[PDB]
Each structure stands twice: as structure tokens, then as C-alpha cells.
């Protein structure tokens, strides 16, 4: 009687939810796509960037937030939601995560290595679920080919999402508190594959 | 409620500053050296610096201020802000500097050697950034090409900006008190090197 079904979704779900608005973006001219991402790697550089272009679709500006907002704009501008959208939607996401994993973020876009991380966070709240329930994994980062110890980015990342990392076995153990971040990060990352290129 | 931001990156300032450089790169080469000549007197004289400014807050002047006049108004005379403004911009920026500053420029000018330091001064303006924070640079202008120890004009130039300075590392050491000037010193060399070409 007070709601349909439960409160959380599985990673099939999560997967299906980002994977609607990512289909939008992998159907788009490739030229346009390294101008958001160029754009996109500076606006999370830029923390006040990221502030202006968010309340930008809520006219032009300058700097990183000003070359996202060419990418979805007419002259005059008229913002176009078939392109605005999907940037809301990674916009939002980008909200959960802190400073720091913006600049990792930003540092997977200029290097072009989204998918080693996509594919872990990714893989961790697959073999996480039921999310709510503390655990212990299995999975070792590194053997996937990522940099693993306390200074590598993968590491931080995880380290920011609030899960607690070992340098040796057990690797990761699933927090639940850490759910709200991971979803935000694998979102994050995969809308970002979406445009790059691939 | 109360849009942006104080402070720029140097990727802003280079902007701003490249906006008016632009329209001196665009005059003919024959007025840029009339234009230099008098500029270079203006430098090393204080009081015609003074008056040059109040005659564009036009009667002709004698001296080195009137050699600048003479680029902007004539044979008319009254004002061409297309000539004017570029060396109104270029005169606010030297307030921000002291006299030896100004007798440096007219050095560097009369030298036709502008690039050394406006690339040093640039350098660690784009290295210093984030500017209200105190940090040691690793930076040393001697391996610029520059002179470097207590007395030659590179150091004094940032010595007058209020930059802490050694003859061994660290050789420079950022004041976030120094900002203006710095800004100042890398606005005036750039304007001056449009002019030059280069």
C-alpha cells in the first residue's frame, strides 16, 4: 500500500538508468563530443566553473563552463534539452563526489583512461550487492591493470567514496554509506566513456 | 545572490591582456616605433608619465609625452581611441609599478630584449597560481636565459614586485602580496612586446 517496490536498485538497474541517457550521447557527431570533453575536463578542474555552468541551465560566459555551454546552445541561445539534458544528468552526479576525485575525474579525461576505472567501480558495485550489507571482497584492483597503493588514482577514488583500502588482501570491504558515491562515480565515468569514444 | 569569483587564473589574465595586444599587432610598423620612441622617454620620466596621463585623463606638449601624443590624436588633434585606449591600459598597469620598475622597461625597450622577462614573469605567474597562497617555486631564471643574482635587472624587476628571491634555490618564492604588481610588470612587457614584434 505506501509504494510499489523497494527502496534500492540493483546494478542491472543502475546500469539500465545511466545506460538510457548515455545512448543520447554515444548518437552524437563526434566533433561536437571533444568539445564538451575538453570543455568538461576544465569545468572539473574549475570548482566555480562547475558552479556556473549548473546555474547557466536554470547567455554566454567565459572559460570551461562558456565551452560546455557552446556545445548546447543556439545563437542566440536557447539551450537545446536533447543536449542539456545529459549534462544536467552528469552535472547532478558530479554534485556526490568531493574536489578531489572531480580533478582524478579530469585527469582520466586528458589521459583518455576512463574505462580502467569505469570497469572497477563498476565491477565493485556489481559484486557489492546487497548494498546495504557491509562486506568483504575478493577483487584486487591491480589485476585488472590498474596502479594500486595508497598514492594511485583508482586508490583515491575508492578512498573518497569512503570504502576502506588495503594495500594487500582483503583489498577492498564494501562500506554502505559508500553506495551514494560509487553510483554517482560509475555514472559519472560511464557518461564520460559515453562521449569518448570508444 | 551577491555571480563569479575575485580572483583569475593566469589563462584570464593572458586573455584580457591579449584582447588589447591584439589591436597594437594590428598597426602599421612605421607609428609603433614613434610610438616606442616616446614611451621610452616617458619611462624614464616621471613627471612627462604623469602629464601623458592627464592629457588623455588635446593640446600638444613638448618632450617625450608629447612623442606618445603625436601617435594618438594627430594631425587633427583630438583623441582616436583605437590608438588611445591600448596606451590608457598600458598607463594604468605602470601606476601599479615604482620608478625602477619604469627605468627597467625603458631599459628592456631600448635593449629590444622585453620577451626574457615577460616569459619569466609569465612563467611564474602561471606556476604560482593559485595567487593568495604562499608557496616556493622551483622555477630558476637563470636557466631562462636571464641574468640572475642580487643586482640584475630580472631580479630587481621582481624584487619591486615583492617577491622573496635567491641566488640559490629557492630562487623565488611567492608573496600573494605581489599579485598586483606582477600582473602589472606581465600587462606592461606584453603591451610593450605587441608593439615590438616581438
Not at 98 to 105: A, P, V
Request: glycine share 10%.
Amino acid at each position: 500500500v505506501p509504494a510499489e517496490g523497494a527502496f534500492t536498485e540493483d546494478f542491472q538497474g543502475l546500469r539500465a538508468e545511466v545506460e538510457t541517457i548515455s545512448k543520447e550521447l554515444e548518437l552524437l557527431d563526434r566533433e561536437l563530443c571533444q568539445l564538451l570533453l575538453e570543455g568538461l575536463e576544465g569545468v572539473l578542474r574549475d570548482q566555480l566553473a562547475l558552479r556556473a555552468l549548473e546555474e547557466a541551465l536554470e547567455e554566454p560566459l567565459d572559460g570551461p563552463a562558456g565551452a560546455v555551454l557552446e556545445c548546447l546552445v543556439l545563437s542566440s541561445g536557447m539551450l537545446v534539452p536533447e543536449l542539456a539534458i545529459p549534462v544536467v544528468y552528469l552535472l547532478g552526479a558530479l554534485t556526490m563526489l568531493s574536489e578531489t576525485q572531480h580533478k582524478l575525474l579530469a585527469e582520466a579525461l586528458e589521459s583518455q583512461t576512463l574505462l580502467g576505472p569505469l570497469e572497477l567501480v563498476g565491477s565493485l558495485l556489481e559484486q557489492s550487492a546487497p548494498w546495504q550489507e557491509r562486506s568483504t571482497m575478493s577483487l584486487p584492483p591491480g589485476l585488472l591493470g590498474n596502479s594500486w597503493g595508497e598514492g594511485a588514482p583508482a586508490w583515491v577514488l575508492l578512498d573518497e567514496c569512503g570504502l576502506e583500502l588495503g594495500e594487500d588482501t582483503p583489498h577492498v570491504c564494501w562500506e554502505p554509506q559508500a553506495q551514494g558515491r560509487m553510483c554517482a562515480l560509475y555514472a559519472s565515468l560511464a557518461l564520460l566513456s559515453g562521449l569518448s569514444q570508444e
